[PDB]
PDB file of C-alpha atoms and ligand atoms in Angstrom:
ATOM      1  CA  UNK A   1       8.019 -13.253   0.758  1.00 47.56           C
ATOM      2  CA  UNK A   2       5.199 -11.816   2.857  1.00 49.01           C
ATOM      3  CA  UNK A   3       3.178  -8.582   2.956  1.00 46.98           C
ATOM      4  CA  UNK A   4       5.669  -6.910   5.325  1.00 49.12           C
ATOM      5  CA  UNK A   5       8.682  -7.604   3.203  1.00 49.67           C
ATOM      6  CA  UNK A   6       6.679  -6.623   0.161  1.00 46.94           C
ATOM      7  CA  UNK A   7       5.653  -3.231   1.472  1.00 47.12           C
ATOM      8  CA  UNK A   8       9.074  -2.649   2.923  1.00 46.46           C
ATOM      9  CA  UNK A   9      10.491  -2.990  -0.577  1.00 47.58           C
ATOM     10  CA  UNK A  10       7.868  -0.691  -2.095  1.00 51.88           C
ATOM     11  CA  UNK A  11       7.886   1.999   0.654  1.00 50.53           C
ATOM     12  CA  UNK A  12      11.439   1.938   1.965  1.00 51.49           C
ATOM     13  CA  UNK A  13      12.185   3.144   5.502  1.00 55.26           C
ATOM     14  CA  UNK A  14      12.958   6.756   6.574  1.00 55.43           C
ATOM     15  CA  UNK A  15      13.262   7.847  10.222  1.00 55.83           C
ATOM     16  CA  UNK A  16      12.877  11.570   9.570  1.00 55.75           C
ATOM     17  CA  UNK A  17       9.782  13.254   8.162  1.00 54.97           C
ATOM     18  CA  UNK A  18       9.841  13.193   4.356  1.00 49.46           C
ATOM     19  CA  UNK A  19       7.546  13.935   1.460  1.00 48.10           C
ATOM     20  CA  UNK A  20       6.052  11.055  -0.507  1.00 48.02           C
ATOM     21  CA  UNK A  21       5.604  10.826  -4.277  1.00 47.69           C
ATOM     22  CA  UNK A  22       2.531  13.121  -4.054  1.00 51.43           C
ATOM     23  CA  UNK A  23       4.393  15.608  -1.833  1.00 52.07           C
ATOM     24  CA  UNK A  24       2.635  14.682   1.431  1.00 54.51           C
ATOM     25  CA  UNK A  25       4.437  14.523   4.761  1.00 56.73           C
ATOM     26  CA  UNK A  26       5.235  10.935   5.660  1.00 56.74           C
ATOM     27  CA  UNK A  27       7.543   8.929   7.924  1.00 57.63           C
ATOM     28  CA  UNK A  28       8.740   5.391   8.595  1.00 56.90           C
ATOM     29  CA  UNK A  29       7.499   2.833   6.189  1.00 57.41           C
ATOM     30  CA  UNK A  30       5.121   4.908   4.141  1.00 55.27           C
ATOM     31  CA  UNK A  31       3.138   6.137   7.110  1.00 57.07           C
ATOM     32  CA  UNK A  32       1.210   9.190   5.828  1.00 54.09           C
ATOM     33  CA  UNK A  33       1.049  11.945   8.433  1.00 52.69           C
ATOM     34  CA  UNK A  34      -1.015  14.642   6.794  1.00 54.78           C
ATOM     35  CA  UNK A  35      -2.027  16.031   3.389  1.00 56.60           C
ATOM     36  CA  UNK A  36      -1.695  19.508   4.769  1.00 60.35           C
ATOM     37  CA  UNK A  37       1.248  21.550   3.494  1.00 59.14           C
ATOM     38  CA  UNK A  38       2.280  22.560   7.013  1.00 57.19           C
ATOM     39  CA  UNK A  39       5.404  20.902   8.436  1.00 57.33           C
ATOM     40  CA  UNK A  40       4.224  21.902  11.885  1.00 58.71           C
ATOM     41  CA  UNK A  41       0.938  20.068  11.362  1.00 61.74           C
ATOM     42  CA  UNK A  42       2.977  17.015  10.407  1.00 57.43           C
ATOM     43  CA  UNK A  43       5.117  17.276  13.486  1.00 57.45           C
ATOM     44  CA  UNK A  44       1.979  17.497  15.529  1.00 55.83           C
ATOM     45  CA  UNK A  45       0.438  14.433  13.930  1.00 54.28           C
ATOM     46  CA  UNK A  46       3.700  12.538  14.443  1.00 55.18           C
ATOM     47  CA  UNK A  47       3.872  13.257  18.191  1.00 56.66           C
ATOM     48  CA  UNK A  48       0.239  12.229  18.526  1.00 58.08           C
ATOM     49  CA  UNK A  49       0.906   8.968  16.622  1.00 60.85           C
ATOM     50  CA  UNK A  50       3.976   8.038  18.661  1.00 61.84           C
ATOM     51  CA  UNK A  51       3.031   9.274  22.060  1.00 60.24           C
ATOM     52  CA  UNK A  52       5.968  11.582  22.612  1.00 59.08           C
ATOM     53  CA  UNK A  53       7.735  14.745  21.480  1.00 63.73           C
ATOM     54  CA  UNK A  54       9.666  13.469  18.507  1.00 65.71           C
ATOM     55  CA  UNK A  55      10.644  16.683  16.812  1.00 67.37           C
ATOM     56  CA  UNK A  56      10.238  15.007  13.428  1.00 66.36           C
ATOM     57  CA  UNK A  57      12.360  11.935  14.015  1.00 66.54           C
ATOM     58  CA  UNK A  58      11.615   8.416  15.226  1.00 67.37           C
ATOM     59  CA  UNK A  59      13.437   5.219  15.937  1.00 65.81           C
ATOM     60  CA  UNK A  60      13.364   2.031  13.858  1.00 66.41           C
ATOM     61  CA  UNK A  61      11.326   0.318  16.544  1.00 68.25           C
ATOM     62  CA  UNK A  62       8.769   3.141  16.372  1.00 68.17           C
ATOM     63  CA  UNK A  63       8.704   2.921  12.595  1.00 65.58           C
ATOM     64  CA  UNK A  64       8.027  -0.831  12.752  1.00 68.13           C
ATOM     65  CA  UNK A  65       5.282  -0.360  15.275  1.00 68.46           C
ATOM     66  CA  UNK A  66       3.493   2.146  13.026  1.00 68.36           C
ATOM     67  CA  UNK A  67       3.976  -0.376  10.209  1.00 68.23           C
ATOM     68  CA  UNK A  68       2.326  -3.262  12.070  1.00 64.33           C
ATOM     69  CA  UNK A  69      -0.531  -0.940  12.950  1.00 63.10           C
ATOM     70  CA  UNK A  70      -0.888   0.192   9.370  1.00 62.49           C
ATOM     71  CA  UNK A  71      -0.885  -3.266   7.838  1.00 62.40           C
ATOM     72  CA  UNK A  72      -3.434  -4.419  10.376  1.00 61.70           C
ATOM     73  CA  UNK A  73      -5.671  -1.442   9.633  1.00 59.84           C
ATOM     74  CA  UNK A  74      -5.477  -2.049   5.876  1.00 59.83           C
ATOM     75  CA  UNK A  75      -6.503  -5.677   6.393  1.00 61.93           C
ATOM     76  CA  UNK A  76      -9.325  -4.736   8.748  1.00 61.66           C
ATOM     77  CA  UNK A  77     -10.436  -2.082   6.258  1.00 61.53           C
ATOM     78  CA  UNK A  78     -10.637  -4.579   3.441  1.00 63.37           C
ATOM     79  CA  UNK A  79     -12.631  -6.982   5.596  1.00 64.59           C
ATOM     80  CA  UNK A  80     -15.191  -4.363   6.540  1.00 65.69           C
ATOM     81  CA  UNK A  81     -15.582  -2.942   3.037  1.00 65.55           C
ATOM     82  CA  UNK A  82     -18.514  -4.356   1.048  1.00 64.55           C
ATOM     83  CA  UNK A  83     -16.752  -3.998  -2.282  1.00 66.70           C
ATOM     84  CA  UNK A  84     -13.387  -5.332  -1.140  1.00 69.39           C
ATOM     85  CA  UNK A  85     -14.199  -8.237   1.103  1.00 68.84           C
ATOM     86  CA  UNK A  86     -15.656 -10.439  -1.632  1.00 66.26           C
ATOM     87  CA  UNK A  87     -12.518  -9.981  -3.670  1.00 65.45           C
ATOM     88  CA  UNK A  88     -10.248 -10.775  -0.801  1.00 66.69           C
ATOM     89  CA  UNK A  89     -12.350 -13.804   0.058  1.00 67.54           C
ATOM     90  CA  UNK A  90     -11.973 -14.983  -3.523  1.00 69.90           C
ATOM     91  CA  UNK A  91      -8.198 -14.678  -3.917  1.00 74.22           C
ATOM     92  CA  UNK A  92      -5.222 -16.903  -3.029  1.00 74.56           C
ATOM     93  CA  UNK A  93      -2.689 -15.739  -0.420  1.00 76.21           C
ATOM     94  CA  UNK A  94      -0.125 -14.259  -2.785  1.00 78.83           C
ATOM     95  CA  UNK A  95      -2.628 -12.227  -4.757  1.00 79.54           C
ATOM     96  CA  UNK A  96      -4.216 -10.886  -1.566  1.00 78.81           C
ATOM     97  CA  UNK A  97      -0.875  -9.323  -0.737  1.00 81.24           C
ATOM     98  CA  UNK A  98      -1.192  -7.317  -3.929  1.00 79.14           C
ATOM     99  CA  UNK A  99      -4.648  -6.145  -2.847  1.00 79.76           C
ATOM    100  CA  UNK A 100      -3.323  -5.169   0.597  1.00 80.70           C
ATOM    101  CA  UNK A 101      -0.503  -3.272  -1.087  1.00 82.21           C
ATOM    102  CA  UNK A 102      -2.942  -1.149  -3.090  1.00 83.97           C
ATOM    103  CA  UNK A 103      -5.062  -0.358  -0.061  1.00 84.86           C
ATOM    104  CA  UNK A 104      -2.002   0.589   1.931  1.00 85.61           C
ATOM    105  CA  UNK A 105      -0.984   3.035  -0.826  1.00 86.57           C
ATOM    106  CA  UNK A 106      -4.290   4.522  -1.969  1.00 84.95           C
ATOM    107  CA  UNK A 107      -6.722   3.743   0.843  1.00 84.34           C
ATOM    108  CA  UNK A 108      -9.876   1.658   0.870  1.00 87.77           C
ATOM    109  CA  UNK A 109     -11.883   4.245  -1.000  1.00 91.15           C
ATOM    110  CA  UNK A 110      -9.312   4.612  -3.753  1.00 93.32           C
ATOM    111  CA  UNK A 111      -9.155   0.886  -4.263  1.00 91.01           C
ATOM    112  CA  UNK A 112     -12.943   0.394  -4.108  1.00 93.02           C
ATOM    113  CA  UNK A 113     -13.021   2.674  -7.206  1.00 92.44           C
ATOM    114  CA  UNK A 114     -11.313   0.056  -9.454  1.00 95.89           C
ATOM    115  CA  UNK A 115     -14.733  -1.520  -9.933  1.00 92.67           C
ATOM    116  CA  UNK A 116     -14.000  -3.077 -13.262  1.00 94.90           C
ATOM    117  CA  UNK A 117     -10.622  -4.508 -12.239  1.00 95.27           C
ATOM    118  CA  UNK A 118     -12.091  -5.852  -9.065  1.00 97.38           C
ATOM    119  CA  UNK A 119     -14.725  -7.718 -10.945  1.00 96.57           C
ATOM    120  CA  UNK A 120     -12.103  -9.159 -13.286  1.00 95.82           C
ATOM    121  CA  UNK A 121     -10.020 -10.315 -10.360  1.00 96.63           C
ATOM    122  CA  UNK A 122     -13.073 -11.991  -8.761  1.00 99.78           C
ATOM    123  CA  UNK A 123     -13.649 -13.833 -12.020  1.00100.38           C
ATOM    124  CA  UNK A 124      -9.992 -14.837 -12.133  1.00101.08           C
ATOM    125  CA  UNK A 125      -9.395 -13.192 -15.517  1.00102.58           C
ATOM    126  CA  UNK A 126      -5.759 -12.362 -14.719  1.00105.00           C
ATOM    127  CA  UNK A 127      -4.497 -10.986 -17.958  1.00100.19           C
ATOM    128  CA  UNK A 128      -7.616  -8.917 -18.477  1.00 95.10           C
ATOM    129  CA  UNK A 129      -7.460  -7.515 -14.993  1.00 96.94           C
ATOM    130  CA  UNK A 130      -3.826  -6.619 -15.514  1.00 95.19           C
ATOM    131  CA  UNK A 131      -4.566  -4.547 -18.578  1.00 93.47           C
ATOM    132  CA  UNK A 132      -7.420  -2.810 -16.891  1.00 98.55           C
ATOM    133  CA  UNK A 133      -5.435  -1.998 -13.757  1.00 95.82           C
ATOM    134  CA  UNK A 134      -2.813  -0.347 -15.933  1.00 99.56           C
ATOM    135  CA  UNK A 135      -5.271   2.158 -17.387  1.00 98.38           C
ATOM    136  CA  UNK A 136      -5.050   4.356 -14.318  1.00 95.27           C
ATOM    137  CA  UNK A 137      -3.484   7.434 -12.866  1.00 95.43           C
ATOM    138  CA  UNK A 138      -1.901   5.057 -10.332  1.00 97.42           C
ATOM    139  CA  UNK A 139       0.059   3.259 -13.034  1.00 97.72           C
ATOM    140  CA  UNK A 140       1.046   6.479 -14.809  1.00 96.99           C
ATOM    141  CA  UNK A 141       2.270   8.194 -11.644  1.00 96.66           C
ATOM    142  CA  UNK A 142       4.066   5.223  -9.987  1.00 97.38           C
ATOM    143  CA  UNK A 143       4.749   2.836 -12.842  1.00 96.57           C
ATOM    144  CA  UNK A 144       7.510   0.732 -11.283  1.00 98.44           C
ATOM    145  CA  UNK A 145       5.567  -0.146  -8.189  1.00100.38           C
ATOM    146  CA  UNK A 146       2.326  -0.528 -10.122  1.00100.09           C
ATOM    147  CA  UNK A 147       4.064  -3.021 -12.435  1.00100.95           C
ATOM    148  CA  UNK A 148       5.245  -5.081  -9.470  1.00101.99           C
ATOM    149  CA  UNK A 149       1.792  -5.184  -7.952  1.00102.46           C
ATOM    150  CA  UNK A 150       0.094  -5.869 -11.250  1.00100.92           C
ATOM    151  CA  UNK A 151       2.544  -8.696 -12.030  1.00 99.41           C
ATOM    152  CA  UNK A 152       1.742 -10.128  -8.655  1.00100.77           C
ATOM    153  CA  UNK A 153      -2.026 -10.127  -9.430  1.00101.96           C
ATOM    154  CA  UNK A 154      -1.335 -11.553 -12.840  1.00103.94           C
ATOM    155  CA  UNK A 155       0.928 -14.464 -11.907  1.00102.70           C
ATOM    156  CA  UNK A 156       0.062 -15.233  -8.342  1.00 99.55           C
ATOM    157  CA  UNK A 157       3.824 -15.506  -7.613  1.00 98.57           C
ATOM    158  CA  UNK A 158       6.512 -13.286  -6.106  1.00 98.73           C
ATOM    159  CA  UNK A 159       8.617 -13.022  -9.211  1.00101.53           C
ATOM    160  CA  UNK A 160       8.410  -9.227  -9.425  1.00100.26           C
ATOM    161  CA  UNK A 161       9.930  -8.876  -5.980  1.00 98.89           C
ATOM    162  CA  UNK A 162      12.607 -11.489  -6.390  1.00 97.22           C
ATOM    163  CA  UNK A 163      16.067 -10.060  -6.908  1.00 96.13           C
ATOM    164  CA  UNK A 164      15.171  -6.693  -5.320  1.00 96.40           C
TER     165      UNK A 164
HETATM  166 CL1   CL B   1      -5.436   5.793 -18.495  1.00100.49          CL
HETATM  167 CL1   CL B   2       7.168   3.720  -9.017  1.00100.45          CL
END
């Protein structure tokens, strides 16, 4: 398992504009287009992202390209963030995928807000971090994915994604 396969399982793949769990216009593999309620604004953002008149639909190749760009950005974001980098530097490869997953979903800012959990992760207090991460809107709104990610931080293995 790797970050791409992981996110692909959590985000799925849709080639037509859709609304995510929060109701925001999205496409491809969880690529957020806009928080605005206007479908036209989304269509505009899509064309700008792809470089052509898409009329709300893209190809699989286009979806994968946006995906590579998004994973790269999430990684770069972590590495430039003063609160996130130290955590990332402290973790093993499997657990860092869980951190990338969160950033991909909630953004750098959102993740930087889990101050307490972040400190527990840095200290390698896995079970404690797991409980703390669960006390969040994130866990209450998307419990299945949150459990997978949390199990990943807790065990340092891919068990939660095996058999999916
Ligand atoms: Cl809570
Ligand atoms: Cl979920």
